[PDB]
mmCIF file with all atom_site columns, C-alpha atoms in Angstrom:
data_model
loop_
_atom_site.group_PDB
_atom_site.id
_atom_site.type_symbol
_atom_site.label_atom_id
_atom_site.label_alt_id
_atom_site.label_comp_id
_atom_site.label_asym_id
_atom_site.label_entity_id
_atom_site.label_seq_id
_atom_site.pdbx_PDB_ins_code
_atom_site.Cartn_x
_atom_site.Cartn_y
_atom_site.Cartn_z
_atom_site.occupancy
_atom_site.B_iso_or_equiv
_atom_site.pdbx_formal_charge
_atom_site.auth_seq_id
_atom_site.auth_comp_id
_atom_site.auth_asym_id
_atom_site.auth_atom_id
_atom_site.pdbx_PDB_model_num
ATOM 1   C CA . UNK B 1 1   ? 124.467 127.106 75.527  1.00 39.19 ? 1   UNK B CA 1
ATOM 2   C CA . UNK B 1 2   ? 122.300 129.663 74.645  1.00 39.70 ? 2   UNK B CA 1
ATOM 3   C CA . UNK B 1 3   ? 120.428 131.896 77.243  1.00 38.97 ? 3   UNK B CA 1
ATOM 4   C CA . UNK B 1 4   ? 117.940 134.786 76.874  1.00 37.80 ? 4   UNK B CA 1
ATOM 5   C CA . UNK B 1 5   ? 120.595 136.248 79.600  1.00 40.21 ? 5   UNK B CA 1
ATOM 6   C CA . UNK B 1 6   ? 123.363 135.850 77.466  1.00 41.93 ? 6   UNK B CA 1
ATOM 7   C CA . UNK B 1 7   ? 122.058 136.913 74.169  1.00 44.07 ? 7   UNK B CA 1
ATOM 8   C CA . UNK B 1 8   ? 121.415 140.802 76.129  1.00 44.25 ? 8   UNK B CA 1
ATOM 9   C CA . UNK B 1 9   ? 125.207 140.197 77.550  1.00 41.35 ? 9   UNK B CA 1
ATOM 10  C CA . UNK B 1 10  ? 126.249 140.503 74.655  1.00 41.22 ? 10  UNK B CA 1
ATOM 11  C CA . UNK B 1 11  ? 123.889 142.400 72.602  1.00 41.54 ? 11  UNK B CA 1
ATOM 12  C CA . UNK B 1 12  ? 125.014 144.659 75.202  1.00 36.00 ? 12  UNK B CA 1
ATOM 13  C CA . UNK B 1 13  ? 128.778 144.651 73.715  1.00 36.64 ? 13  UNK B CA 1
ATOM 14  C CA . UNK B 1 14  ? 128.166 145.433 70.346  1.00 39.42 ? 14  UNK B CA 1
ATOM 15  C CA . UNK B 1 15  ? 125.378 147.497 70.823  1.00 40.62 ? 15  UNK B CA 1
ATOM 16  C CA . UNK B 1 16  ? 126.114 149.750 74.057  1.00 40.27 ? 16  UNK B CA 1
ATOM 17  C CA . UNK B 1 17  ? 129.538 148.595 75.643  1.00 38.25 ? 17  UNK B CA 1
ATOM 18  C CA . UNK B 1 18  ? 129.544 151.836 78.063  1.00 33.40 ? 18  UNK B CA 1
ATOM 19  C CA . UNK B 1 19  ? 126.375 151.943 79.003  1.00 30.00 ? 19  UNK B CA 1
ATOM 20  C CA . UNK B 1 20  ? 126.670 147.998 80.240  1.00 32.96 ? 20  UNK B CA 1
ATOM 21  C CA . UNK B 1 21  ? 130.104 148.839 81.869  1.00 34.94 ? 21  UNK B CA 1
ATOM 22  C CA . UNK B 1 22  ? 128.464 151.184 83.710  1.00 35.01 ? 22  UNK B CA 1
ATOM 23  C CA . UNK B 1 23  ? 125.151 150.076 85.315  1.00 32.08 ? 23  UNK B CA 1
ATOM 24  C CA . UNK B 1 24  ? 124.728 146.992 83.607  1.00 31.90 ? 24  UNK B CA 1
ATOM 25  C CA . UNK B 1 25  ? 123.778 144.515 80.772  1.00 28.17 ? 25  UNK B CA 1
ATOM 26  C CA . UNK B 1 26  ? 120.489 143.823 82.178  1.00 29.76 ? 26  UNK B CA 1
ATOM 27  C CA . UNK B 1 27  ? 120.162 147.640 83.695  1.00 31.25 ? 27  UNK B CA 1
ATOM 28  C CA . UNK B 1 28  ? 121.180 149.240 80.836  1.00 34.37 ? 28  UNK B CA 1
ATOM 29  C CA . UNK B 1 29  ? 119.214 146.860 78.496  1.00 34.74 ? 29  UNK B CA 1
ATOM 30  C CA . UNK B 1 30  ? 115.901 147.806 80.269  1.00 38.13 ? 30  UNK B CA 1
ATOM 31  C CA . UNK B 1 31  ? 117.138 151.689 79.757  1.00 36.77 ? 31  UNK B CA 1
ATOM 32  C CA . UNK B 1 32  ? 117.255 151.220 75.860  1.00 35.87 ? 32  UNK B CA 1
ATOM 33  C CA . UNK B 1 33  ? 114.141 149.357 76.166  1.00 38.96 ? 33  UNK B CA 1
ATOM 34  C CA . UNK B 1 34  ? 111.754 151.886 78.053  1.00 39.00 ? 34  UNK B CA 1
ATOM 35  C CA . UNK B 1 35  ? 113.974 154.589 76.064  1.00 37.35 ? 35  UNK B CA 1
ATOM 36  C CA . UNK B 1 36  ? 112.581 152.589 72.480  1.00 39.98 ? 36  UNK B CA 1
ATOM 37  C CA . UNK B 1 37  ? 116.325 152.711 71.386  1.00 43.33 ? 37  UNK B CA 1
ATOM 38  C CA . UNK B 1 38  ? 119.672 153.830 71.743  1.00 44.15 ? 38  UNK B CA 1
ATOM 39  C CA . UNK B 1 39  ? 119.182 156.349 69.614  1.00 45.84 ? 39  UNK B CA 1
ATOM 40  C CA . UNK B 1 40  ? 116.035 157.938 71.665  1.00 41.53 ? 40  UNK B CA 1
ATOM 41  C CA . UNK B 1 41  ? 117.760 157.358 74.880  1.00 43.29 ? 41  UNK B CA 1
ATOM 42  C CA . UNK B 1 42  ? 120.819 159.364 73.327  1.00 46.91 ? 42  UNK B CA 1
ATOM 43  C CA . UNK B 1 43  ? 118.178 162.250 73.107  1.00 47.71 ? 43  UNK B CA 1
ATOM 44  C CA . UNK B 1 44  ? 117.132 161.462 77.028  1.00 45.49 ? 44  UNK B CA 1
ATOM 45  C CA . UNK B 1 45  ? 117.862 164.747 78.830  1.00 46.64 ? 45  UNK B CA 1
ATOM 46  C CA . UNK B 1 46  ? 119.247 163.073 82.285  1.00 46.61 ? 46  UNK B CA 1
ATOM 47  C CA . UNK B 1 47  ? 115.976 164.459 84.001  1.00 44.54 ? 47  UNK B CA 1
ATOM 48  C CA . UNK B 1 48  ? 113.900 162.050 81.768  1.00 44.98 ? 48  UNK B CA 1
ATOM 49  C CA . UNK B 1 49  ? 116.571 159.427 82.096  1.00 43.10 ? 49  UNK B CA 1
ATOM 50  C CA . UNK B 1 50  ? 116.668 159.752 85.833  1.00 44.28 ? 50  UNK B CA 1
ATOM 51  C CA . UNK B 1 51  ? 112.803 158.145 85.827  1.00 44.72 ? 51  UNK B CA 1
ATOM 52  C CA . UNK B 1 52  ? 112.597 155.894 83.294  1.00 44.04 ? 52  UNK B CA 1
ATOM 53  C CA . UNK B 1 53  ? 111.896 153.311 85.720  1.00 45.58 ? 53  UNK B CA 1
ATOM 54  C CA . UNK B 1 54  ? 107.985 153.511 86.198  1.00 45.52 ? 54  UNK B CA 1
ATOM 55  C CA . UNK B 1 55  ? 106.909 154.750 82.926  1.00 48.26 ? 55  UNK B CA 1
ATOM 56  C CA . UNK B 1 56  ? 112.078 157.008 91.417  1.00 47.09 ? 56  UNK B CA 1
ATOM 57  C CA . UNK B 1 57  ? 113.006 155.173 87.333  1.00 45.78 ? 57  UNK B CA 1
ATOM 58  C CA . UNK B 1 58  ? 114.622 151.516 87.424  1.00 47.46 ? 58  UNK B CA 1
ATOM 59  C CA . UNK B 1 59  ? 118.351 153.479 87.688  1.00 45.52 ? 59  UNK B CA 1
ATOM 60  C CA . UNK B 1 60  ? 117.519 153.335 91.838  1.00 47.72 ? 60  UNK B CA 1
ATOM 61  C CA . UNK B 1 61  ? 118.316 149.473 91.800  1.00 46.64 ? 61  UNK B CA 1
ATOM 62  C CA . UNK B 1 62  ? 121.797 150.595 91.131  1.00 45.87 ? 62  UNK B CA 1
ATOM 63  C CA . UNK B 1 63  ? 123.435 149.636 94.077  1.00 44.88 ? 63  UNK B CA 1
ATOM 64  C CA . UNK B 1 64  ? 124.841 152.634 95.617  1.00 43.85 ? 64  UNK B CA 1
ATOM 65  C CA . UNK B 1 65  ? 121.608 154.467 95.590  1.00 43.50 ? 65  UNK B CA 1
ATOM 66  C CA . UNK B 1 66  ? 120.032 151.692 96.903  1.00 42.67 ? 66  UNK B CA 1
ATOM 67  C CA . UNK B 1 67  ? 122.513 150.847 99.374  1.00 43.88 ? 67  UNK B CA 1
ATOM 68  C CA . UNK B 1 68  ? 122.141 154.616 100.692 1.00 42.20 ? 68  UNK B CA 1
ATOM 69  C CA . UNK B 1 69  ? 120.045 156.719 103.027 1.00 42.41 ? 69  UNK B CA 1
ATOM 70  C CA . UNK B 1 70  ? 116.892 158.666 101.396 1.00 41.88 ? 70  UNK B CA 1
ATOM 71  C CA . UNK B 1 71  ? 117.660 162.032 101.407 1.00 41.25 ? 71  UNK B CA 1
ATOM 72  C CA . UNK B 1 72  ? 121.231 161.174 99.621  1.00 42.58 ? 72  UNK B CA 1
ATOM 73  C CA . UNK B 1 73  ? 119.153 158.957 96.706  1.00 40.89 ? 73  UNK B CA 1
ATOM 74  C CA . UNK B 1 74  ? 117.676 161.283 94.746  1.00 43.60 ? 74  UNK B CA 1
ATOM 75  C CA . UNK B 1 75  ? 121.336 163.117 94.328  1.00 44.29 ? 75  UNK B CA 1
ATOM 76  C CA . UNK B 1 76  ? 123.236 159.973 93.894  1.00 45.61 ? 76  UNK B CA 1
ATOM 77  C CA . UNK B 1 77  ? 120.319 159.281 90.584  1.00 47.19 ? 77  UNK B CA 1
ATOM 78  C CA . UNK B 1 78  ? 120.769 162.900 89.174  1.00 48.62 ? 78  UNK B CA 1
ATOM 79  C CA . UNK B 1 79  ? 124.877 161.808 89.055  1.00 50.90 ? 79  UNK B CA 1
ATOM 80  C CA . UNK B 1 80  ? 124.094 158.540 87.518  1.00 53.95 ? 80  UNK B CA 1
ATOM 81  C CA . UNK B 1 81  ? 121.202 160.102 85.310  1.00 53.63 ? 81  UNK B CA 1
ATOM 82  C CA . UNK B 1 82  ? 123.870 162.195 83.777  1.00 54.19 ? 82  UNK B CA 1
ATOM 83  C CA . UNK B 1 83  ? 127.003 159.588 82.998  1.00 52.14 ? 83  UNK B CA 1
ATOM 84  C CA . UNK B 1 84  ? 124.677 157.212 81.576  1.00 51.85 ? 84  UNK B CA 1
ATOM 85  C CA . UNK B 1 85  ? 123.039 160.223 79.069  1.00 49.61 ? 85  UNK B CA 1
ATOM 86  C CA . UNK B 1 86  ? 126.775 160.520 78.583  1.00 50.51 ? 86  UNK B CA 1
ATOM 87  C CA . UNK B 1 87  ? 127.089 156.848 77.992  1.00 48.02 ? 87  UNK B CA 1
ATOM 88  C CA . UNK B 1 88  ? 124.759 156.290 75.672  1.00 50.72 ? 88  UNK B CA 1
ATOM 89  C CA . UNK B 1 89  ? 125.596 158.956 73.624  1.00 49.30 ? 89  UNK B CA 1
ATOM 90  C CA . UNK B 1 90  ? 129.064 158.138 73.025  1.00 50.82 ? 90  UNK B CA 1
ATOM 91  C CA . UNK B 1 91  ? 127.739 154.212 72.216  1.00 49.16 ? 91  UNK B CA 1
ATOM 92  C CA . UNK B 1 92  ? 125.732 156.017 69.408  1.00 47.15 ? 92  UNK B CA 1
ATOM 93  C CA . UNK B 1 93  ? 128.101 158.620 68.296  1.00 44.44 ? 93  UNK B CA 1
ATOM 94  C CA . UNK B 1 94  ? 131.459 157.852 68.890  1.00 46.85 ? 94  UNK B CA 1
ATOM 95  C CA . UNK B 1 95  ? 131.526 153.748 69.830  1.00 46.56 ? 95  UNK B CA 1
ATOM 96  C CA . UNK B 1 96  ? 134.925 154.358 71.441  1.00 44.65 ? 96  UNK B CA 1
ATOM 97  C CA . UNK B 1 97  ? 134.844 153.585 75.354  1.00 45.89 ? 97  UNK B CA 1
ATOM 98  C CA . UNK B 1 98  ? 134.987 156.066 78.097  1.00 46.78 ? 98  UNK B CA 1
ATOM 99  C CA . UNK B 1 99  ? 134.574 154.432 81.436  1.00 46.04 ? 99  UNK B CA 1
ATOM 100 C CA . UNK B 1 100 ? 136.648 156.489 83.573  1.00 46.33 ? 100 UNK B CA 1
ATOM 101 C CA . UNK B 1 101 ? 132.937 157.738 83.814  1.00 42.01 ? 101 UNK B CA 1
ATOM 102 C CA . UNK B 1 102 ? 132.450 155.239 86.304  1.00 39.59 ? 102 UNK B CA 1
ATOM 103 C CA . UNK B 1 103 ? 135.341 157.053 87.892  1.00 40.17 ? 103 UNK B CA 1
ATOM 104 C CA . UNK B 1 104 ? 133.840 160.664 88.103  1.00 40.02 ? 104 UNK B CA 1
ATOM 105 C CA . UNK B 1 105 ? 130.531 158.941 89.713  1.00 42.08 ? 105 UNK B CA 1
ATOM 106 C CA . UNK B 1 106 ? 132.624 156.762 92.375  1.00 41.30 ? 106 UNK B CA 1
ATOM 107 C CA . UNK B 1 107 ? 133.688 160.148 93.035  1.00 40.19 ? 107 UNK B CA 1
ATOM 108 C CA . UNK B 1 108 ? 130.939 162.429 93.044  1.00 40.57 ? 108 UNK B CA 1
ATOM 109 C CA . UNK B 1 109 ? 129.037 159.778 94.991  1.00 41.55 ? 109 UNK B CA 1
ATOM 110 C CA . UNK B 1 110 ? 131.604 160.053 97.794  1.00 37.65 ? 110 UNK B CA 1
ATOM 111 C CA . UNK B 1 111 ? 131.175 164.001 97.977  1.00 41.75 ? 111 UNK B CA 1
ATOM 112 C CA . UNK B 1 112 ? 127.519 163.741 98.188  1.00 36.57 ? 112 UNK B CA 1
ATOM 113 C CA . UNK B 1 113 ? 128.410 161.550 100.769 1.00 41.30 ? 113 UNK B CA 1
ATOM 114 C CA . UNK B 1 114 ? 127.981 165.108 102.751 1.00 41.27 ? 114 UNK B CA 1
ATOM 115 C CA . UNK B 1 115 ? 125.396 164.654 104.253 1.00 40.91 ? 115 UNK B CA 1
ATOM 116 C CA . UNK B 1 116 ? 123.332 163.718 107.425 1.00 43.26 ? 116 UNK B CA 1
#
């Protein structure tokens, strides 16, 4: 029972276990990809990060920026932009897991939730 999904979910869990806690195994894989590594993506400011997508980057499928008004997008990707240069930095450096980080986003997403 071998699937190209499941090889990446768990590539994913050796490889980048905050990063794929955070966004995604098949998300974050695509990151690392259009990054060329986890350890170039590491070196992503959070601006580059924040458009990886075509080259608006792939992180606006994440739900919540999807799932919200314009206007409020483009803050809600800077947030994300920045825990997951946060998240693949500590899958290169440290390997330990933070993912409270997907606390201090679920929270920062509900104050930029001031808006109209």
């Amino acid at each position: 029972a071998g699937g190209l999904e499941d090889y990446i979910d768990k590539a994913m869990d050796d490889v980048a276990p905050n990063l794929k806690a955070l966004v995604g195994a098949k998300l974050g894989a695509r990151l690392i990809s259009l990054a060329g590594g986890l350890k170039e993506l590491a070196m992503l400011p959070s601006s580059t990060i924040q458009v990886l997508g075509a080259e608006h980057g792939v992180i606006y499928q994440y739900p919540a920026i999807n799932r919200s008004p314009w206007w409020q997008r483009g803050k809600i990707a800077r947030a994300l932009a920045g825990k997951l240069a946060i998240a693949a930095r500590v899958d290169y450096f440290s390997g330990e897991y933070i993912a409270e980080e997907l606390k201090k986003e679920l929270e920062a997403r509900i104050k930029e939730i001031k808006e109209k």
